Nucleic acid binder design. Structure first.
Length: 430
RNA sequence: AGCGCCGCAAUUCAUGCUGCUUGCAGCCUCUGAAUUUUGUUAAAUGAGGGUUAGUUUGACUGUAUAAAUACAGUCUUGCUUUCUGACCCUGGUAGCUGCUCACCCUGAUGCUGCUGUCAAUAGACAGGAUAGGUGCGCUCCCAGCAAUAAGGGCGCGGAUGUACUGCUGUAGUGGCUACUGAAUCACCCCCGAUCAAGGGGGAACCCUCCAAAAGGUGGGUUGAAAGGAG
């Protein structure tokens, strides 16, 4: 699946300042001016009647800005970066003191080469003089090494390699703000974000992609190419087994590995089981959540800038749950991980508070509402969207599917997980 | 008092265990779920602001496997995050500034709360998280204040006046920028780059050999995990 890999690009002060002048003082002005000229263009409104502006506008407004004196000329790929950035920003709008990123559509825009010291280096097409190396960890090193090897593998074939099978597919070159003062090229740390596809790493995965990619002069000309390709068996997840993930307030995500054929349950993996040594994180996140809503509502107008919202502990917990759920779907050979819909979750939470209140104080409504009010204080709504996103990401990475479900309104959390998995299996026939 | 968490107990169980008839039967050593109970000089959550290009969390190749996986060997690079651990501080001055304030009444997802000494409310040297609630946390409670939610009272110089200000400072409390002191570590320590870069020196535990023991070798562990950037 798609995944973005980071790397710190490193070169000398001369090359860095050259790039800085190109971007911050000769292309960031280009970006801003193209943005206003999009704003100050006579037929601005007529396109909003459709709600989308096609690629025509930037295509015709790209070239008049080549010889504008304040721009001092850019390499062609930097013009492509600018036009793609304005495309991205106006698409994000139609729904700081830091230069706009650089956008590279394909890998051929990046040339890789080993130096005498052995490290990988990357230049960009149309630049050819800046020798930005690549800095990264082992979790990313094999990625860049494989990009270099595929580059070396296309040239030996006299450039008869299809571009899709290449591992690296996109790339973002951005500056990142830091501390200190002085010049900003030696202050903002350049970083390369590489977008790849794991589906195109394992040899079996690579051979999977050829069939649909044909779906016309060179449609099948250079499909077959060996590369260097590790062969690892594709994870063949058998169906008939679903891992429902009941989402709730007190138990945010409890799973039950259901064998739906005989309605037998294979594994009631609770959250204390889905997290292990990471269970201590769960309550911790709530300790932060109850904190934030206390401070966020305190400064009602958001006037006071404080540190609330400090950590991404929710993100880490949520991806930990994703990893554990996919691992526990593998261990029982599950053919899906089942999640409910966030659209059908606003009522689920409130039904849960009401049911817990009734089971704690039966009939005594004036005490039921009291208990519910002090229960909303202590246990807050989970970041369910992050959970669903991270679980879908890990499921795509490993290969298991995510299908829609329908959480039951009442019952035990394990009972809700089991019945949610069964409901998803029932909907699977549809 | 109330509520959420933690797991100490019991009970009932299984998602757990036993040779099966392979789905049933039986019992709670390991792994857990629920209900109730309990808070023990006990188990386990939790406990303030920062700090590493940190270690493990990798990839490939042969074997074993019905396999998650284990071993052997080759390479290795540092990106962004989460814990844990260790460590450092609870900032100094120079500005732009917020936000509120006759005196009152209860009081608000209102504010503050650590030990100790001097000292007088208000706070200075020095310790430092174990920062009020004896299991822990809290929009709950308490102690204090409340001008810094409301909301309702109520006043001296003034107003052409019908509105509004003084009693508002030589305050209380939050932001922004700049110069600044300590950590700049992941077994410990020294030297370096922090657009690059690693190399020394050492202690704790090892597997094994020279022998006969000790001692002296070769290799290895000295916390782990996660990741799609918008």
């Amino acid at each position: 699946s798609q995944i973005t890999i980071q790397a710190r690009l490193i070169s000398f002060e001369s090359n860095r300042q050259q790039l800085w002048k190109l971007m911050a003082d000769l292309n960031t002005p280009l970006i801003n001016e193209l943005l206003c000229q999009l704003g100050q263009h006579p037929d601005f409104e007529k396109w909003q009647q459709k709600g989308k502006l096609p690629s025509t506008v930037v295509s015709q407004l790209c070239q008049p800005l080549k010889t504008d004196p304040r721009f001092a000329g850019q390499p062609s790929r930097l013009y492509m970066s600018a036009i793609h950035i304005v495309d991205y920003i106006y698409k994000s709008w139609l729904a700081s003191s830091l230069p706009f990123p650089l956008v590279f559509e394909t890998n051929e825009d990046m040339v890789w080469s080993k130096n005498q010291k052995g490290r990988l280096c990357v230049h960009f097409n149309g630049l050819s003089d800046l020798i930005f190396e690549v800095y990264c960890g082992n979790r990313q090193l094999h990625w860049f090494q494989r990009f270099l090897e595929d580059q070396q593998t296309k040239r030996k074939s006299k450039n008869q390699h299809s571009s899709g099978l290449f591992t690296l597919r996109n790339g973002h070159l951005v500056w990142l703000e830091g501390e200190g003062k002085g010049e900003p090229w030696n202050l903002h740390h350049l970083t390369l974000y590489c977008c790849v596809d794991n589906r195109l790493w394992t040899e079996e995965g690579t051979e999977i992609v050829r069939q649909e990619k044909a779906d016309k002069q060179s449609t099948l000309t250079r499909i077959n190419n060996s590369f260097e390709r590790p062969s690892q068996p594709l994870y063949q997840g058998q169906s008939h087994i679903l891992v429902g993930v009941s989402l709730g307030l007190e138990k945010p995500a409890t799973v039950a590995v259901v064998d739906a054929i005989a309605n037998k349950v294979l594994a009631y993996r609770s959250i204390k089981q889905l997290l292990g040594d990471n269970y201590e994180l769960l309550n911790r996140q709530r300790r932060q959540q109850q904190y934030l809503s206390h401070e966020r509502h305190k400064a009602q107008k958001n006037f006071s800038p404080n540190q609330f919202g400090a950590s991404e502990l929710g993100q880490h917990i949520d991806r930990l749950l994703a990893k554990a759920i996919v691992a526990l779907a593998r261990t029982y050979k599950a053919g899906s991980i089942v999640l409910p819909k966030l659209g059908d979750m606003r009522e689920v939470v409130q039904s849960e508070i009401q049911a817990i209140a009734e089971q704690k104080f039966p009939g005594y409504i004036e005490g039921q509402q009291k208990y519910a009010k002090q229960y909303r204080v202590n246990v807050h709504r989970w970041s369910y969207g992050r959970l669903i996103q991270s679980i879908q990401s890990k499921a795509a990475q490993t290969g298991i599917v995510i299908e829609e479900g329908k959480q039951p309104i009442r019952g035990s959390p394990h009972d809700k997980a089991k019945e949610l998995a069964l409901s998803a299996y029932n909907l699977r026939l549809t």
